[PDB]
Design a protein around this ligand. Structure first.
Ligand SMILES: [Cl-]
Ligand SMILES: [Cl-]
Ligand SMILES: [Cl-]
Lengths: 968, 958
C-alpha cells in the first residue's frame, strides 16, 4: 500500500512544489486533453493555485495524476506491463474507467493517481470523477457552484475503483422551446448558438455523465452556426454523440431545408417525398456526406416541418404507412452508400413520436410498420405524451427486437393543452416511477429528455441522467429514494455553504415547490382551479406556501456572498417564482369569492394579489442581472394566465373591489364550506357545522365578516353546557376590524355517543343558528384502519389500507402493492410491483383491502383518484379488480370510453394531473370490505371516495380530505 | 249675461274691498265648509291677499262666491225658486256640481259664482273646480306647488258648467308597503299616522277627484291612531269613503286583532272561523258597531281540504257577516256598500267546478262589489265574461304602482309608465270593471303623475279612456303645465316632458331594485351604449332645469321631476357602466379601470340625491327615499349587494385588442387563433357608417397601421399609437363609397399591431330593392327584425252596427318603439269571421323552415282557461291559431316570473317560407295580445343575445 496519495497547496505553490501535477501525452485524444484542462481548473478552484501539466516525465511532482485512454497511452501500457494496474479489467468495455492509486510508477514519482478510460468517454468520466472527489459539482460552470476550499486531499495508498458500464447506452437531453429565453441568453452571453456557447453545454452534459444531445433547432442550424462546422467538430472532439429530433432525418436539422430549397434547386421546393422525391433524396444524401463521419445517431423516417404531420387531414393510415416504408428503404440505401456499407455498424433511430406510434403498429386492415426488416438494428424511440406520462411500451415479443428501444421524455413542452416552459415543474417521484417503468418494459438503449432552455431544470436533469447512468443504484430496486437523491444533490451543491439544519431547509424548498408546481403547472394555474373555501384546500396551500417562502428568505439572507448566485439560481428563483405565482392566483380566488358576497375584506385581498404580481416581475429582473447577466433572458417566457395552449392573449388576474352597503350587516360563514348567512328570517338562517362528526376532532370555527363600513355588534350564545365559543360579544366596523374568527369547543368528557347543540349568532339585522352535531363514539369495537361514515361520505388515502396480500413468483420475488411516498397530488399512491406484469385475478394479482362502515345498505358510488397514466399496449385499455365483501370480483376499465392520448378526456386529466373514475357497488349496513386487485400496468391509486348513489359532494381540486378511521 | 264675474287683488285688499268674498251658511255641511276654507287659502296663494267669508249677506262683496249642497242650503233653493239656477239638472245625481255665474242674485251682490253640489262630494269637487280655474295644482299642498300669481280673473257673465257623474263609482288609492319610508316621514312631520297627517292625504285624494282610501295598515291602526277615532271622524266629515284590503273584513284593520286576541279574550286566540267561530264573530260584530255608522265600504269574506267544504265555509262566513251588517249597520243590505276580493285562492270557491255550485250568482253576493286584481306587477288577470257583467253590484280592480313581494319588490321611486296604465285600465273598463278602482301607491311620493292619471281616467273615462287612444303624451304635457305654468317657458316644459316620459319608459323596462349587471348586453346591438347616451342626454336636461328653476319653485321641481329622474337614471347608468367595466376587464383592457371609477361615482351620487331629497323644504320629504333599492338578490332587500368593480393589471407585451363595435367579435391578431373578423353593418343598403375599436392591454407604447385593399373602402386613420396611460383606445370609422358600387362587393381592412395582424372583412349590399313595395323587409344579415308597427297593410272588419275591429298602434308602448293591439279589446275574434289582421312583407334568401318569434307585452289571459291565441298565416296558406303562452302558464309560475321582470314575453313557432317575397298575416283572436316586435331567422340559427332583441333590420323606404 505505502503512503497515501496526497495533493495540497504546498505541492502547487511555485516556492515549494516538486514538479508538475498532471502528465501529458502526445498520443492522448484531443478531447481528453481538453477535459483534463477543465479538471486542472477545478483543482485551482479547490486549492487556490493553478496546477501545471508537463510532457517531460522528469518534471512531474512526487505525487502525480496520470490519465489516459487504453490504446492511446504508452504510459498506461507500461504500467500494465509492470503489473501496477490491470487493464484487462476495463479493456473492451463501454464508457468505463479505472481510478487507482499506485506506488512508485516511474522514476521521480512516489505516488500517482492513475485514471484509465476504456475509450474516450470512459476517460472523460474518470477525469470528472477526480473532480467529484475534490468536491466539485457538475454545475460548477453551468450554475456557478463554487467548490469548498481545501488545503489538502488524500486517498489511501491502495485506492482502487472500476466504474460499471452505463445502464442506458445513449443518455442525454434536447435543448428545445428555446425562444425567447435561450435565444436572448445565447446572443447576449456568446453572440449566438456557436461553439463558444456549446462548449458549456457539452461540459454540462459530460459532467452529468450523459453522452447524447439534440441541439437547438428552432432558429439555429447546429451544422452551420459554429460558425461553419465548428459546433459539430467540437462535439465530435469531446465524444458528445449528436442526434436529431423526430423530424430531422439524415443529419439535416430542421432549418437547413429552408435555405437550400427553391424552384431551381437540386433539392426541389417541397418537403414532400411523393412530389419532390429526387430533391429530398439528394438533400438527405448531401446531409449524410457532410457530417456522416462524425459521431452521431442518424434519425430515419419523415415528419412535417416544425413538428407537424407529414400528410394532410385526408391522409389514410395505409398511406401514412406506405410512405414511411418508402422513405426508410431509401434512407438506409443512402446510409450504406455514403456513411458505412455495414448498416449494423451505423446507429439509427426511428421516432414513434405522436401520430407516428399509430403508424408503427397498424390495425386490423393495415398490417403495420412493426417488424419491418428495414427496422432491424434500428433503435425504436418511444415517446411520452409530452406531459411526462409514458404511452405504449414494448410487449414481451417486441423486446426481442435487435436495436432496442428509446424513450423521449419531457420536462418542457411547447404545445397543447397548455405549454410549460418557464420554470421547472417536474417532480422526482413521478420521474422515477415513469422512467423506471420504461426500463422495466425493456426501454434501455436510449433516453433523452426535453429540457427547454435548460435553466432551473438542473435537479431533475441530474436525476434523469444519474438514473440512466446507474440504474441499479437509483432505479426500480431503489424505491422511495428520490428524497435521498435530493439530499445528496443538495450536499453536492452546498457542502460547506449551509449547515445541516440549513440543508434540510433547502430540502423542504426543493421538494416543496416541485410537488406544488407539478400539481398545476405555472402557465395553467389560474383562479378557481383550487376551490376558494371547500375542505380548506386554498388556505392549507397558502399556509404551506407562506412557510416555504419564509424559509427561502431566511437562506437568502444567510448564504454568503460567494455562494449567493448558486443559491439564487438553483433554489431561490425556482421556489419563489413558482410559489409566488401559485399564491397570487389562490389569493385572487379568495378575492373574487369574498367580493361576490360584498365582503369588505375582498379589498385587502386584491392588494395582496397586486403585490404578488409585482414580485413576479422583480424576481425575474433579479434573475436576469445576478452575476453580470449570467442568466440573462432565461426567465423571459410569458407564464401568467394562459387562455390558449400558447401565450397569445394571456391575461393577468382580474381584481374585484367591493363597495360597502348601507346597513350594518354581518355575514356568518362556516369555515371550510360555502355555507353562509346574514340571518334573515325570510331566507337561509340555519347552518350546519359538521367538524365534530369525527370523534377525534376537537376544534372548528366560523367567521363573522363586515359588508358595510358601519359598526356592527354581534352576540353569540349556545344552548348546551358542553358547547362553547371563543367569544360572547364583539363589534366589527368595516374599517379597522373587518372579520372575526370564532372558535367552537365541544367538551367530550361524559358526552353521549351522539349529541346535537346549537349556537346562536345575533347581528344588527337578524340571527344565524349554527347546528353542531357531534359523534363521540370512538369505534374501538372495529379494527384499526376501519373508515367510519359519519359525514355522509368516506374519503381514504390509498396508503391507509387495512391489509394487503402479495403473491410469490418462482425466483422467490413477490408481487405486491407498494406505497410510493409523496407521490401524486396528495399524500401518496400505491402501485403494484413488478410493473410490467399483466396480472389475473385469482391467479397472481396482489390486492390491498380497505375496511369501512356504512350507515345504510344500498348502492354506493366508488370513485378512484388515479395518476393519469396511459395504457401500455396498443389496445388502449387499463383494468383493475374490485371486490366488495364476498361478491364476485369485478374487473373494471378505469379509462373513459374512447380514451386516447390527445383526446378530450386525456387533455383535461393531464392538466389536472389526475384521473377520476366511478363505479357503483352494493354495500351492507355496517362493516364492509373492499379489495382492489392490480391487473393492467400503469394503475397508480391515490385516493378512494365512497358516497351514496345520487349524492353530490362539495367540488374541489384535490377531492375531499381524508375522513375518520379507527386508530387515526 | 251682462258684465263678467271678476275677482282681482283690489277686491280683496282691506282698504278697497266692498265686502267678503265667500258666503257661509250655518246649514252647510261641516266638511264642505272645511274644503271652502282650503279654497280660500288657494285664492290667497293666487292673488296674495286672504279672502274673507261672512254669514251676513249684507256684508258680501259686489262679486261673491256662493257655494252649497242641494238640500243643505236655503240660498240655493232661493236662487232655484227665482229661476237664476236650475237645480233639476243636478238633483239626485252622484258627485255632480253646477258652476254658474249669475247676475244680481241678492241685494248688494252684482255678480256671483254659484257652486252647487248634488251631494257633499259634488260640492267639494265644485269648490276645487274653482281652484283649478285659478291655476292651483291638485299637488299645491302635497308637493308644495305654488300657483302663478294673478292680478285678475274673469268669467263670462253667462258662464255655466254642469259636471258629469264620475265614470267609476269608487276611485282612490292604498297607502301600503309603508315602512321604512312613509313611517319615518309621518313620525318626523306629524308624530305618527294621526289625523294631522291624514288631513293632507284626504286633501290630495279629493283634489284628484278620488273618494276612496285604504289607509296604512302594516303597523298602524287607522281606527285607533287618531288618537282614538279622529282619523275615521275626519274621513267621514270630508266624505272620504274608507275601505280595507282583502284580508281586513268588517271594518277591522289588519293590526287590530293582535292587540285584542288572547286565551281569555272574548275574541279568542286564533284567526280561524271553524275553531274560534264565536270569537271571530264577536270581533266582527264589535268592529261593525264601532265604525259602521261612518261612510265606508265593508270588506266581507275571510282569508288542506275539499272544494265543496271550502265553498260551504266561505258561504257560512259571508252569511254570518251579512247578518251582522243587517243587525248592526242597516237592515237593508242593499243600502250597505260591501266588497269581496276575488283573489286567486278564493276564485275556485267563486266559480265552483263541474260538480259543486260556486258562490257566483248566489244570494250572498247579491249587490256586493266583486274586486278583481292585477298580478301585483301592473298586468291584469282574469276579467268578467259577458254573462258575469250582469252582476248587480259590479266589479272592482285593485292595481299596483308599488309592491312588496315576488319575484322582486318595487318600492323606491315610481317605475310605472302611462301608456301601460292606460292600456290595462281601459281594458278593465271595456270588460265591465267600472264600480271601484283602487291603486297601491306605496308611500305616495314620486307617484304623483301616474296617480293623477289613474284618478283622472277613473273620473272622466270619455275624455281619457278607450276613445282617447294615444293621448297619454297630451296628458303628461297638461300635467306639466298644471305644475309649472309661469315657472318654465315652452322650451323648458318640453324638456320636462322628455325627462318624465324618458325616465318612466326606462324604469318600466327594468325596475330599479331588479336592475343589475348584464341585464342589458354590454356590447350586442349597441343596446348598452344607446341607453347610456339617452341617459346622459336626460341627466344633462335635468341638471339644466335644476340650475334654471326659480327659487320659489325649486322644491316642486326637485320632488316631481329631478329626484325621480336622476334617482332612476343614475341607477340604470351605474349598472350599465358596471357591465362595460366587467366586460372590458375580462379582456384585460386598461379602460376597465376608468369605467370602475365611473360606477363608483354613480353610487356616491345615489346617496347624495337621497340625502338632498330628505333635507329640502325643512324635511318636507324626510324619509321618503329611505327604502333599500340597489342590487336585490331576493324578492326583498335582504342580502342585497352593490356593483362589484373589476380592475385590470397591465400585461407585459405591447398588445392591442381589435373589436367590432356592436358585437363580441374581437382579436389580438395572433396567427394561431382568431384573426379575421366580419364587420356586417354595410349589408344594409342605406347604412353609411360603421366602426371598430383598438384598445390597450398594456401600459406600453403600441403602434398600429391600418390599410384596406379596395378603392371604395376607407378608414378614418392609417397609423396611430396608444400607450395604456393617457390614450387607451381609439375608435376607427369605416367608410364605403357606394357611388358606382356593384350590388354586392367585399373588401378587407388590415390592422397591424406590434404582435400580429387582424383582418376585418367588410361585405356590402348596395342593391336599392326598389323592385319591392315599400315596407318590404329584406334579409341581408341572416335574420329579419320588424318593429310591429311596420306592417305593410292591415284589414279591418265591420260589425253590423257599422263599427270597426282593427289593429291600432299604441305610440311609445312597450320596451322599444311601440306595439299593436286589436280594438275593441274585449272581443274573442274568429279567423274568417271578424278577426282583423296586419300583414308584413319580407324577402328571404332561401326557401325553408324559419323560426317566427314574437316579442309580446306579458299580459295574462282574460279567461279562466289560461290560454291566449293569435292567428298566423303565411302566403295565404292555412291559418294556424297558435297559443302564445308557455305550457302550464299561470300567474306566480316560473315563466310568469321571468317575463314579468323582463317586461316582455317571447314565443316562437316554425313557419315555411318561399324563396324571395313572402307575406305574413297576424290575426287577433284572444284579448290581451299586444305585439311589439317580430324576429324571423332560419331554423337552427342562434342570434347574439340581448335584452331588447335585435334592432330592426332594413326595409324598403326606411
Ligand atoms: Cl380522451
Ligand atoms: Cl258593463
Ligand atoms: Cl308560468
Amino acid at each position: 500500500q505505502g503512503m497515501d496519495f496526497t495533493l495540497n497547496q504546498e505541492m502547487l505553490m511555485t516556492d515549494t512544489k516538486s514538479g508538475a501535477l498532471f502528465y501529458q501525452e502526445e498520443e492522448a485524444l484531443s478531447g481528453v486533453r481538453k477535459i483534463a484542462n477543465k479538471v486542472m481548473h477545478d483543482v485551482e478552484l479547490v486549492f487556490g493555485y493553478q496546477p501545471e501539466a508537463t510532457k517531460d516525465r522528469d518534471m512531474l511532482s512526487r505525487h502525480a495524476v496520470l490519465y489516459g485512454t487504453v490504446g492511446h497511452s504508452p504510459l498506461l501500457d507500461e504500467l500494465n506491463a509492470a503489473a501496477l494496474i490491470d487493464l484487462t479489467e476495463i479493456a473492451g468495455k463501454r464508457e468505463v474507467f479505472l481510478f487507482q492509486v499506485v506506488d512508485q510508477p516511474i522514476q521521480g514519482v512516489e505516488k500517482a493517481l492513475v485514471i484509465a478510460g476504456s475509450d474516450k468517454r470512459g476517460t472523460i468520466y474518470g477525469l470528472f470523477h477526480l473532480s467529484e472527489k475534490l468536491g466539485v459539482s457538475p454545475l460548477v460552470d453551468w450554475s456557478g457552484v463554487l467548490p469548498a476550499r481545501k488545503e489538502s486531499f488524500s486517498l489511501k495508498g491502495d485506492y482502487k475503483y472500476v466504474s460499471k458500464e452505463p445502464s442506458v447506452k445513449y443518455r442525454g437531453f434536447f435543448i428545445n422551446d428555446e425562444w425567447p429565453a435561450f435565444g436572448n441568453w445565447s446572443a447576449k452571453n456568446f453572440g449566438g448558438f456557436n461553439a463558444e456557447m456549446y462548449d458549456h453545454v457539452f461540459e454540462l452534459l459530460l459532467r452529468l455523465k450523459g453522452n447524447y444531445l439534440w441541439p437547438a433547432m428552432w432558429s439555429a442550424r447546429f451544422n452551420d452556426d459554429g460558425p461553419g462546422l465548428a459546433n459539430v467538430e467540437l462535439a465530435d472532439e469531446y465524444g458528445v454523440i449528436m442526434g436529431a429530433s423526430h423530424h430531422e432525418p439524415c443529419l439535416r436539422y430542421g432549418e437547413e431545408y429552408k435555405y437550400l430549397r427553391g424552384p431551381d434547386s437540386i433539392y426541389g421546393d417541397a418537403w414532400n417525398f411523393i412530389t419532390n422525391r429526387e430533391g429530398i433524396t439528394k438533400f438527405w444524401e448531401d446531409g449524410l456526406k457532410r457530417t456522416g463521419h462524425f459521431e452521431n445517431i442518424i434519425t430515419i423516417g419523415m415528419r412535417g416541418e416544425a413538428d407537424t404531420k407529414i400528410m394532410g387531414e385526408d391522409a389514410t393510415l395505409e398511406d401514412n404507412i406506405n410512405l414511411l416504408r418508402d422513405v426508410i428503404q431509401t434512407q438506409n440505401k443512402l446510409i450504406k452508400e455514403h456513411v458505412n456499407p455495414n448498416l449494423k455498424e451505423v446507429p439509427r433511430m426511428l421516432a414513434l413520436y405522436k401520430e407516428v406510434e399509430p403508424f408503427f403498429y397498424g390495425d386490423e386492415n393495415t398490417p403495420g410498420l412493426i417488424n419491418s426488416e428495414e427496422l432491424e438494428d434500428v433503435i425504436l424511440m418511444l415517446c411520452d405524451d409530452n406531459h411526462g406520462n409514458l404511452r405504449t411500451l414494448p410487449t414481451e415479443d417486441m423486446r426481442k427486437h435487435s436495436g432496442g428501444y428509446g424513450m423521449y421524455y419531457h420536462f418542457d413542452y411547447h404545445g397543447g393543452p397548455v405549454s410549460y416552459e418557464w420554470i421547472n415543474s417536474s417532480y422526482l417521484p413521478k420521474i422515477w416511477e415513469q422512467m423506471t417503468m420504461a426500463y422495466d418494459f425493456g426501454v434501455r438503449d436510449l433516453w433523452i429528455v426535453n429540457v427547454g432552455d435548460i435553466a432551473t431544470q438542473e435537479l431533475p436533469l441530474s436525476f434523469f441522467l444519474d438514473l440512466a447512468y446507474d440504474f441499479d443504484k437509483w432505479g426500480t430496486n431503489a424505491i422511495n429514494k428520490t428524497d435521498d437523491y435530493t439530499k445528496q444533490w443538495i450536499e453536492q451543491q452546498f457542502a460547506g455553504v449551509f449547515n445541516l439544519e440549513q440543508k434540510d431547509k433547502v430540502f423542504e424548498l426543493l421538494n416543496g415547490y416541485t410537488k406544488i408546481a407539478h400539481n398545476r403547472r405555472p402557465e395553467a394555474m389560474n383562479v378557481d382551479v383550487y376551490h376558494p373555501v371547500n375542505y380548506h384546500e386554498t388556505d392549507q396551500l397558502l399556509d404551506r406556501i407562506d412557510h416555504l417562502l419564509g424559509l427561502a428568505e431566511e437562506l437568502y439572507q444567510e448564504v454568503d456572498q460567494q455562494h449567493f448566485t448558486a443559491y439564487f439560481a438553483l433554489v431561490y428563483y425556482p421556489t419563489v417564482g413558482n410559489l409566488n405565482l401559485q399564491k397570487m392566483w389562490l389569493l385572487n380566488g379568495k378575492n373574487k369569492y369574498a367580493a361576490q358576497l360584498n365582503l369588505i375584506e375582498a379589498n385587502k385581498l386584491a392588494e395582496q394579489v397586486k403585490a404578488c404580481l409585482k414580485r413576479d416581475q422583480e424576481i425575474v429582473d433579479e434573475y436576469h442581472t445576478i452575476a453580470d447577466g449570467k442568466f440573462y433572458g432565461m426567465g423571459l417566457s410569458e407564464h401568467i394566465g394562459f387562455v390558449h395552449w400558447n401565450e397569445d392573449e394571456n391575461k393577468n388576474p382580474v381584481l374585484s373591489y367591493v363597495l360597502p352597503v348601507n346597513k350594518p350587516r354581518l355575514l356568518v360563514s362556516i369555515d371550510g364550506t360555502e355555507l353562509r348567512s346574514e340571518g334573515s328570517p325570510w331566507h337561509v338562517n340555519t347552518l350546519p357545522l359538521v367538524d365534530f362528526l369525527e370523534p377525534d376532532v376537537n376544534q372548528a370555527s366560523f367567521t363573522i365578516s363586515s359588508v358595510s363600513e358601519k359598526k356592527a355588534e354581534y352576540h353569540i350564545s349556545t344552548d348546551q353546557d358542553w358547547l362553547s365559543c371563543s367569544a360572547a360579544n364583539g363589534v366589527l366596523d368595516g374599517k379597522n376590524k373587518l372579520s372575526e374568527t370564532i372558535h367552537v369547543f365541544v367538551d367530550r368528557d361524559g358526552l353521549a355517543d351522539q349529541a346535537e347543540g346549537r349556537i346562536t349568532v345575533k347581528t344588527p339585522v337578524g340571527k344565524v343558528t349554527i347546528v353542531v352535531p357531534v359523534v363521540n363514539n370512538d369505534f374501538t369495537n372495529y379494527p384499526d384502519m376501519t373508515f367510519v361514515d359519519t359525514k355522509g361520505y368516506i374519503s381514504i388515502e390509498a396508503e391507509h389500507f387495512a391489509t394487503q396480500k402479495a403473491t410469490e413468483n418462482l425466483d422467490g420475488t413477490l408481487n405486491r402493492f407498494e406505497v410510493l411516498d409523496g407521490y401524486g397530488k396528495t399524500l401518496s399512491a400505491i402501485k403494484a410491483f413488478p410493473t410490467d406484469t399483466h396480472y389475473q385475478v385469482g391467479k397472481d394479482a396482489p390486492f390491498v383491502e380497505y375496511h369501512f362502515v356504512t350507515q345504510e345498505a344500498g348502492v354506493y358510488e366508488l370513485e378512484f383518484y388515479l395518476q393519469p397514466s396511459n395504457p401500455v399496449t396498443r389496445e388502449g385499455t387499463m383494468y383493475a379488480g374490485i371486490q366488495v365483501n364476498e361478491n364476485d370480483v369485478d374487473v373494471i376499465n378505469v379509462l373513459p370510453d374512447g380514451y386516447h392520448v390527445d383526446g378530450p378526456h386525456w387533455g383535461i386529466d393531464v392538466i389536472n394531473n389526475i384521473r377520476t373514475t366511478k363505479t357503483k357497488i352494493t354495500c351492507e349496513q355496517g362493516l364492509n370490505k373492499l379489495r382492489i386487485y392490480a391487473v393492467s400496468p400503469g394503475f397508480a391509486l391515490e385516493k378512494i371516495v365512497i358516497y351514496p348513489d345520487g349524492k353530490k359532494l362539495a367540488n374541489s381540486y384535490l377531492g375531499p380530505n381524508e375522513t375518520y378511521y379507527v386508530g387515526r
